[PDB]
Amino acid sequence: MLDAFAKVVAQADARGEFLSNTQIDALSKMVKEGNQRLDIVNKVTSNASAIVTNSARALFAEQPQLIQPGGNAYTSRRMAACLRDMEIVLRYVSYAMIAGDSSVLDDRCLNGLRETYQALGTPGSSVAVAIQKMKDASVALANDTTGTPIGDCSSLVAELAGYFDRAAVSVV
């Protein structure tokens, strides 16, 4: 897989070029916000079980036919596979937040997941609702200042919200 820094080298090797001065200074900008990026992923993985079990509880109150008899999350194994998949999606999103790009999320989490859900009868549009519930439960927690020095890291939160949006549109 690639991270953000190794993505720039892969662009520069294919043109056979040394890196420029502006490409160096763009890379030293990602180093400067490294402590604010590490502080986000720490905020998300520390509450990772509560993101999943509360975004699921809001989903089954909004779409109550998923836990009625015949519903896709009705039995104890179908209920536990639903909480498994939300935890898998949230895990690879946390991986893509320290790397800087969605290379591990596309290859190791999303590849073939839409076709897996069609073959199962799992409603793929309902999985997208539960990922967007995990999106703003994580974004609202990443914007919480209790424990961090005060400052503006809103560009990083708009990047984390794009990994959740990437997995939400790649599941339906």
Partner 1 sequence: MKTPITEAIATADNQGRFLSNTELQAVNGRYQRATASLTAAKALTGSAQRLITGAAQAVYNKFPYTTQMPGPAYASSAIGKAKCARDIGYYLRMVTYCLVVGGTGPMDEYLVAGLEEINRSFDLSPSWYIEALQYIKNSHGLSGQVANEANAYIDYAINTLS
Partner 2 sequence: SIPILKYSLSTQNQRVESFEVNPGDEQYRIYSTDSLPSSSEVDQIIWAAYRQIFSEHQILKSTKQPFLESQLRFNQISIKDFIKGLVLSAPFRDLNYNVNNNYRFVEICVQRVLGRDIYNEREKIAWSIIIATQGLEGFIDTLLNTQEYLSNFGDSIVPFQRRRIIPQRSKGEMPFNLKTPRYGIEFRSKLAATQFSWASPIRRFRPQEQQPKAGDPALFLNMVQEMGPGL
Ligand X SMILES: *C[C@@H](*)[C@H]1/C(=C/c2[nH]c(/C=C3N=C(/C=C4\NC(=O)C(CC)=C4C)C(C)=C\3CCC(=O)O)c(CCC(=O)O)c2C)NC(=O)[C@@H]1C
Ligand Y SMILES: *[C@H](C)[C@H]1/C(=C/C2=NC(=C\c3[nH]c(C[C@H]4NC(=O)C(C=C)=C4C)c(C)c3CCC(=O)O)/C(CCC(=O)O)=C2C)NC(=O)[C@@H]1C
Closest approach of its own copies to the CB of residue 11, in Å? 11
Cα 57 to its chain centre, rounded Å, is 19
Told to check if 120 binds partner 2 by CB under 8 A, we report: yes
For 108, the token pair is 């190791």
d(CA 39, CA 144): 11
User: Taking a C-beta distance cutoff of 8 angstroms, is the pair 86, 134 a contact?
Assistant: yes
Span of 3-11, 95-103, 114-122, 148-156 interacting with ligand X by CB under 6 A: 114-122
CA angle 82, 89, 142 (to 5 degrees): 115
Shortest approach of partner 2 to residue 29 CB, angstroms? 12
| Count of Cβ atoms closer than 10 Å to residue 147 Cβ | 9
Q: Give the residue ranges of the annotated binding site for (2R,3E)-phycocyanobilin.
A: 35, 39, 72, 77, 82-88, 153
Contact between 113 and ligand X by CB under 6 A: the answer reads yes
**Site residues (CB under 8 A) for partner 2, limited to 48-77:** 70, 72, 74-75, 77
Q: Are 69 and 131 in contact (CB under 8 A)?
A: no
Backbone Cα Rg of the chain: 18
Give whichever of 8 and 73 is closer to ligand X, judged by the CB atom. Answer: 73
Where along the sequence are the contacts to partner 2 (CB under 8 A)?
1-2, 10, 13-14, 70, 72, 74-75, 77-78, 80-81, 84-85, 88, 103, 106-108, 111-113, 115-116, 118-121, 123-126, 128-129, 132, 150-155, 158, 172
